[PDB]
Design an enzyme around this catalytic site. Structure first.
Site, PDB file in Angstrom:
ATOM      1  N   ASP A 194       0.829  -1.195   0.000  1.00 59.32           N
ATOM      2  CA  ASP A 194       0.000   0.000   0.000  1.00 59.32           C
ATOM      3  C   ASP A 194       0.872   1.258   0.000  1.00 59.32           C
ATOM      4  OD1 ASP A 194       0.942   0.467   2.646  1.00 59.32           O
ATOM      5  OD2 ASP A 194      -1.049   0.308   3.526  1.00 59.32           O
ATOM      6  N   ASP A 196       1.127   4.908   2.210  1.00 57.83           N
ATOM      7  CA  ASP A 196       0.694   5.561   3.396  1.00 57.83           C
ATOM      8  C   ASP A 196       1.025   7.056   3.387  1.00 57.83           C
ATOM      9  OD1 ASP A 196       0.160   2.864   4.765  1.00 57.83           O
ATOM     10  OD2 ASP A 196       2.231   2.766   4.405  1.00 57.83           O
ATOM     11  N   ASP A 257      -3.594   4.481   2.442  1.00 63.73           N
ATOM     12  CA  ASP A 257      -3.996   4.897   3.792  1.00 63.73           C
ATOM     13  C   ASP A 257      -3.740   6.408   3.909  1.00 63.73           C
ATOM     14  OD1 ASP A 257      -4.779   2.387   4.938  1.00 63.73           O
ATOM     15  OD2 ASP A 257      -2.637   1.790   5.147  1.00 63.73           O
TER      16      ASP A 257
HETATM   17  C1  LIG Z   1      -2.214  -0.791  12.862  1.00 67.25           C
HETATM   18  C2  LIG Z   1      -1.319   0.405  13.068  1.00 67.25           C
HETATM   19  C3  LIG Z   1      -0.124   0.502  12.358  1.00 67.25           C
HETATM   20  N1  LIG Z   1       0.699   1.557  12.536  1.00 67.25           N
HETATM   21  C4  LIG Z   1       1.963   1.656  11.770  1.00 67.25           C
HETATM   22  C5  LIG Z   1       2.894   0.439  11.796  1.00 67.25           C
HETATM   23  C6  LIG Z   1       3.410   0.329  10.365  1.00 67.25           C
HETATM   24  O1  LIG Z   1       4.840   0.361  10.303  1.00 67.25           O
HETATM   25  C7  LIG Z   1       2.834   1.552   9.652  1.00 67.25           C
HETATM   26  C8  LIG Z   1       2.501   1.386   8.172  1.00 67.25           C
HETATM   27  O2  LIG Z   1       1.671   0.242   7.962  1.00 67.25           O
HETATM   28  P1  LIG Z   1       1.709  -0.579   6.586  1.00 67.25           P
HETATM   29  O3  LIG Z   1       1.126   0.331   5.432  1.00 67.25           O
HETATM   30  O4  LIG Z   1       1.034  -1.871   6.922  1.00 67.25           O
HETATM   31  O5  LIG Z   1       3.254  -1.114   6.611  1.00 67.25           O
HETATM   32  P2  LIG Z   1       4.584  -0.706   5.765  1.00 67.25           P
HETATM   33  O6  LIG Z   1       4.286   0.517   4.941  1.00 67.25           O
HETATM   34  O7  LIG Z   1       5.717  -0.649   6.762  1.00 67.25           O
HETATM   35  O8  LIG Z   1       4.898  -1.954   4.782  1.00 67.25           O
HETATM   36  P3  LIG Z   1       4.146  -2.316   3.374  1.00 67.25           P
HETATM   37  O9  LIG Z   1       5.199  -2.195   2.306  1.00 67.25           O
HETATM   38  O10 LIG Z   1       3.673  -3.745   3.571  1.00 67.25           O
HETATM   39  O11 LIG Z   1       2.991  -1.352   3.227  1.00 67.25           O
HETATM   40  O12 LIG Z   1       1.672   1.895  10.396  1.00 67.25           O
HETATM   41  C9  LIG Z   1       0.327   2.598  13.448  1.00 67.25           C
HETATM   42  O13 LIG Z   1       1.054   3.601  13.636  1.00 67.25           O
HETATM   43  N2  LIG Z   1      -0.818   2.538  14.149  1.00 67.25           N
HETATM   44  C10 LIG Z   1      -1.663   1.506  14.016  1.00 67.25           C
HETATM   45  O14 LIG Z   1      -2.719   1.492  14.690  1.00 67.25           O
HETATM   46 MN   LIG Z   2       2.429   0.692   4.009  1.00 66.96          MN
HETATM   47 MN   LIG Z   3      -0.748   1.083   5.297  1.00 63.97          MN
END
Ligand SMILES: Cc1cn([C@H]2C[C@H](O)[C@@H](COP(=O)(O)OP(=O)(O)OP(=O)(O)O)O2)c(=O)[nH]c1=O
Ligand SMILES: [Mn+2]
Ligand SMILES: [Mn+2]
Length: 333
Positions: A194, A196, A257
């Site tokens: 995803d 973020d 996100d």
């Molecule tokens: C569930 C949750 C996650 N997080 C954080 C932990 C993760 O490192 C971060 C981003 O989540 P992701 O989008 O799941 O993880 P990522 O970007 O590190 O890896 P990917 O390449 O699979 O997308 O959000 C919070 O800060 N609060 C929360 O409530």
């Molecule tokens: Mn992510």
């Molecule tokens: Mn995410």
């Protein structure tokens, strides 16, 4: 000598032990699928140690003197070095339980508890899920509708295009509002599942009602396949989206996100949301265990004094905890 906490050492994006760490992370994942959270953390920690090593592990004598390498993790690495394969890892990979839990948990909106329930109820395939739509949330329905795209790794070029449309929508809705790329892409990853984004405004409160206006704009442009807005409950305002990303001659669904934070809490939200998940787990454990403070995405709280730490930056937060600053590209634990 290498420090025990992942937050006390640099972990770069690329390393010399990908085969070994991948094997350990399979065992970690499978343990999580079975609810064995301690065993998950053990394997994850061992994998993260290998990621921080400056050289490849070619003999078992190189495991001597490393933290978080108990018997089970050492044996895994041993069988890999001596035989090129670990039979437990191969059994796990081939097992119907793991393959199904992996299939279901990678669907947008499905966690371990849901996946395990569906498994116990005799569901196995994506078609089985589609035949029981009464069992699915709207988010899960969207996830199934787009599962081919959502399983395709998201590329940095996708991220660049998305950040542009999000920046334009944010900039139009509210001049001065900022968009910051977080998650794995901020840590330097070249691909992800995803994208973020963390949205704020330098005047506290000017961010109120911004996210819905951003979403209206993106929706009007045809860029949104699915959107679930949630107001902060306890706890940031956020939108769980699937974007329709145009491509040359077609288009791709991509998970995005969008998180809004008030600028007072922004450095905590940035830190929390930049990850990695293990690094943040380890940083929070360190803050609590070593320093007596509770760190989360909103603040750093001293529960004895009943006080909150004021931070203008991530660097301030590290400083306050007694840790050397690690830039995001060294938090790949
Ligand atoms: C569930 C949750 C996650 N997080 C954080 C932990 C993760 O490192 C971060 C981003 O989540 P992701 O989008 O799941 O993880 P990522 O970007 O590190 O890896 P990917 O390449 O699979 O997308 O959000 C919070 O800060 N609060 C929360 O409530
Ligand atoms: Mn992510
Ligand atoms: Mn995410």
């Amino acid at each position: 000598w290498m420090p025990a906490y992942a937050c006390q050492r640099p972990t770069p994006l690329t390393h010399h032990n990908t085969g070994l760490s991948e094997a350990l992370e399979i065992l970690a994942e499978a343990a999580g699928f079975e609810g064995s959270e301690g065993r998950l953390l053990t394997f994850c920690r061992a994998a993260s140690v290998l990621k921080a090593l400056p050289s490849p592990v070619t003999t078992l004598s190189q495991l001597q003197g490393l933290p978080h390498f108990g018997e089970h993790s050492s044996r895994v690495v041993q069988e890999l070095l001596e035989h090129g394969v670990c039979e437990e890892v191969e059994r796990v990979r081939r097992s119907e339980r793991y393959q199904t839990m992996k299939l279901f948990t990678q669907i947008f909106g499905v966690g371990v508890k849901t996946a395990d329930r569906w498994y116990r109820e005799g569901l196995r395939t994506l078609d089985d899920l589609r035949e029981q739509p009464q069992k699915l949330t709207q988010q899960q329905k969207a996830g199934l509708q787009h599962h081919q795209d959502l399983s395709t790794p998201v590329l940095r070029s996708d991220v660049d295009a998305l950040q542009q449309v999000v920046e334009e929508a944010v900039g139009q809705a509210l001049p001065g509002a900022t968009v910051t790329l977080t998650g794995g892409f901020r840590r330097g990853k070249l691909q992800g599942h995803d994208v973020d984004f963390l949205i704020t405004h330098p005047k506290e409160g000017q961010e109120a009602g911004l996210l819905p206006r951003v979403m209206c704009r993106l929706q009007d442009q045809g860029l949104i396949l699915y959107h679930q807005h949630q107001h902060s409950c306890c706890a940031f305002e956020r939108s769980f989206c699937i974007f329709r990303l145009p491509q040359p001659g077609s288009w791709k669904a991509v998970r995005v996100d969008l998180v809004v934070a008030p600028v007072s809490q922004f450095p905590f939200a940035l830190l929390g949301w930049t990850g990695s998940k293990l690094f943040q787990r380890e940083l929070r454990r360190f803050s609590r265990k070593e320093k007596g403070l509770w760190l989360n995405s909103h603040g750093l709280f001293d529960p004895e004094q009943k006080t909150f730490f004021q931070a203008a930056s991530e660097e301030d937060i590290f400083r306050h905890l007694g840790l050397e600053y690690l830039p995001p590209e060294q938090r790949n634990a």
